[PDB]
């Protein structure tokens, strides 16, 4: 296996999903056959027995771990090796082990995590562990990083005293459990002065590279057990060699074959399509205040913006609106002229009814107009409430693209559930760069399963889950299916303005059968399956077509006077001549224009002197 199979992980902390079994099962479903945990390991409410075999396969966790209120005897997390811990439990600890006991004095007993030997960041918490045994003997300094040992507040209160006794041969009575295998494996303390980083043994040869995390199998940079910063294939790197090496000699830049792009923890040669590529040479997710997203030959580039910038409006639950966990009456204010939404959009029920707890006013249904300005979203969209007043999604009329670089649970770029809406009415939505679409739980929402999604998806692995929406059986009876003018490809509603692609032609945004060529009020021409109105100068023709272009240059006949094919209002006066000299022409009964005689100052009503009396 090239990559390790991942599970998304949860941040819900102490939220119990129904009963203990229900939560346990949600866990089982999530973390079954999981190799690397993207999120957090929340082992909460694990009661007596509830055998946790499937957890053995878990190797590491990006975030913190919370083991709380687990009366279970055995928690076999033997193959768990390391915790990056980029997030802390309550900004304090990387691991929180609390209240593992029952009323009857039965709690966590066996915990043979013999391979867990490193924690990059964060501290650890211990309290209320009566049944806990063996783990006590762990000499933590090997594992935890020096920076945090002051913040570490842990205590082994082995009140029961019914515990096992480490196999003698274990390194200085440090053991995770019974048997020779469960002896605590220490790879830090025995690294002699010379070796600053991790080591295999005491022999100075065994100095591992600094860039190793869990240890190494040799001194070479590739041999690291777990790459600290970046995992460039086998090798473990600090920062991807930039695109071009600075030449010491010439004081110039030379193209570097080693040059790569820093995408998260990987030095790659190519970013995921949707992601923004900088001239710096790192795959990024959004531009800062400096500049906006400059389209540069079909890839996003943060080319510097001169003077006023389009800027980025921090989406909900990010940057300047991280406190807020749903767009409400308060935060919505700061969305006046938003063109780029650098974040997500959470529309929760509490926003509309208002929250007593947070003292947030009820969101006014009338204030949904603000959203017309929004044109794109870097991340995903969640809508779990909609006002009674409106059934159509007017608010998102001019919502074009959802970039969805960040997805809810890394799986979905959009979610609309438990709504009262009837028609989708999204008549500018023509692309979802990446991320899945889930439409479910809509009582009376037609038009749902009519769109051709394959067109809108651009990336491998974009799935679609549209279920429990108003059956076509009912919709078709009341005529809530694709209008005559909407192509079979897809339709957003019953209106002719909500068609994805028009059958034949269209007047602006509204599909129609055929352009008004012969008769009708707007005399129009057909360009690119669209009808555009001729310039007023173009005189309507009963039988012949009126015009073949927007400008007045393409009129067959002029409404008033004629000056060639270019139909001008009247014979030009002051038209560009010699060094911008005013030119005077005279009209005729046949609407023909000819030059006057120089003499006539007040214009001329005929050739020569005879034209202009005074």
């Amino acid at each position, epitope marked *: 296996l090239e990559e390790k199979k991942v599970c998304q992980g949860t941040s819900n902390k102490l939220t119990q999903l129904g009963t203990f079994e229900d939560h346990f099962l949600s866990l089982q479903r999530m973390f079954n056959n999981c190799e690397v945990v993207l999120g957090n390991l929340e082992i909460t409410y694990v009661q007596r027995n509830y055998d946790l075999s499937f957890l053995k396969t878990i190797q590491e966790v990006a975030g913190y771990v919370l083991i709380a209120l687990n009366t279970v005897e055995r928690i076999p997390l033997e193959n768990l090796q390391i915790i990056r811990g980029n997030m802390y439990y309550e900004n304090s600890y990387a691991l929180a082990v609390l209240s593992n006991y029952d009323a009857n004095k039965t709690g966590l007993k066996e915990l043979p995590m013999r391979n867990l030997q490193e924690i990059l960041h964060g501290a650890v918490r211990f309290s209320n562990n009566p049944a806990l045994c063996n783990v006590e003997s762990i000499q933590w*300094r090997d594992i935890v990083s020096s920076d945090f040992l002051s913040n570490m507040s842990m205590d082994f209160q082995n009140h029961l005293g019914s515990c096992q006794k480490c196999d003698p041969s274990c390194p200085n*009575g440090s053991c995770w459990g019974a048997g020779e295998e469960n002896c605590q494996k220490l790879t830090k*303390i025995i690294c002699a002065q010379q070796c600053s980083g991790r080591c295999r043994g005491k022999s100075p040869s065994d100095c591992c590279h600094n860039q190793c995390a869990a240890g190494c199998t040799g001194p070479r940079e590739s041999d690291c057990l777990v790459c600290r910063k970046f995992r460039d294939e086998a090798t473990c790197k600090d920062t991807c060699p930039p695109l071009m090496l600075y030449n010491p000699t010439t004081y110039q830049m030379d193209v570097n074959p080693e040059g790569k792009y820093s995408f998260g923890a990987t030095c790659v040669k190519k970013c995921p399509r949707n992601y923004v590529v900088t001239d710096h040479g790192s795959c990024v997710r959004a531009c800062g205040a400096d500049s906006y997203e400059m389209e540069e030959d079909g890839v996003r580039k943060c080319k510097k913006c001169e003077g006023p910038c389009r800027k980025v409006c921090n989406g909900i639950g990010i940057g300047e609106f991280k406190d807020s966990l749903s767009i409400n009456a308060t935060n919505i204010k700061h969305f006046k002229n938003c063109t780029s939404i650098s974040g997500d959009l959470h529309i929760l029920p509490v926003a509309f009814r208002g929250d007593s707890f947070t003292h947030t006013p009820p969101l006014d249904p009338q204030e949904l107009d603000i959203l017309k300005t929004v044109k794109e979203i870097t991340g995903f969209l969640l809508i779990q409430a909609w006002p009674e007043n409106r059934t159509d999604l007017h608010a998102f009329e001019n919502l074009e693209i959802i970039r969805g670089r960040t997805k809810q649970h890394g799986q979905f770029s959009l979610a609309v559930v438990s709504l009262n809406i009837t028609s989708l009415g999204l008549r500018s939505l023509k692309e979802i760069s990446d991320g899945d679409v889930i439409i479910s739980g809509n009582k009376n929402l037609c038009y749902a399963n009519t769109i051709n999604w394959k067109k809108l998806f651009g990336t491998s692995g974009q799935k679609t889950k549209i279920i429990s929406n108003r059956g076509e059986n009912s919709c078709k009876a009341t005529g809530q299916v694709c209008h005559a003018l909407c192509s079979p490809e897809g339709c957003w509603g019953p209106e002719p303005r909500d068609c994805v692609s028009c059958r034949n032609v269209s007047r602006g945004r509204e599909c129609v059968d055929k352009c008004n060529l012969l008769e009708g009020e707007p005399r129009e021409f057909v360009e690119n399956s669209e009808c555009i109105q001729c310039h007023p100068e173009c005189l309507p023709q009963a039988m012949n077509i009126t015009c073949t272009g927007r400008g007045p240059d393409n009129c067959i006949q002029c409404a008033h006077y004629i000056d060639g094919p270019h139909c001008v209002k009247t014979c030009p006066a002051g038209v560009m001549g010699e060094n911008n000299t005013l030119v005077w022409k005279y009209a005729d009964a046949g609407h023909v224009c000819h030059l006057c005689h120089p003499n006539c100052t007040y214009g001329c009503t005929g050739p020569g002197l005879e034209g202009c009396p005074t």
Partner: nanobody, 122 residues
Framework: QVQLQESGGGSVQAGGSLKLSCAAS????????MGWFRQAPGQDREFVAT???????DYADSVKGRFTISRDNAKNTGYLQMNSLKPEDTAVYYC????????????????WGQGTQVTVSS
């Protein structure tokens, strides 16, 4: 997070017997592993012995079989029986402690006693 203090440093006849002690100034003594270190005058500071907070002993090879480190949780003290002494033993002796490690590296113990001179006759 607690202080320390030695006792017993002095002069003895080559091949004699002695008994050193290290008293912890504070609380939670049982939680701290205890270690002895020595520095020969005009040399660098070197490891002597240790005993984990889990009551696991460990000796340096020089003193192994001649020295017997020990600890008494009740009295918050530690001891070191030293027999068949050698003129090579003359050094400045310290005792360090630590809750979260029982290693041999001088760097891993960050709470230190103040030490005493120990001499063995020529």
């Amino acid at each position: 997070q607690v202080q320390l203090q030695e006792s017993g440093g002095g002069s003895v006849q080559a091949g004699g017997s002695l008994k050193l002690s290290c008293a912890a100034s504070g609380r939670s003594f049982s939680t701290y592993a205890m270690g002895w270190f020595r520095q020969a005058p005009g040399q660098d500071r070197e490891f002597v012995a240790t005993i984990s907070w889990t009551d696991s002993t460990d000796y340096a090879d020089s003193v192994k079989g001649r020295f017997t480190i020990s600890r008494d949780n009740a009295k918050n003290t530690g001891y070191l029986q030293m027999n068949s002494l050698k003129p090579e033993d003359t050094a400045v002796y310290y005792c360090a402690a630590d809750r979260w490690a029982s290693s041999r590296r001088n760097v891993d113990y960050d709470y230190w006693g103040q030490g005493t001179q120990v001499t063995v006759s020529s």
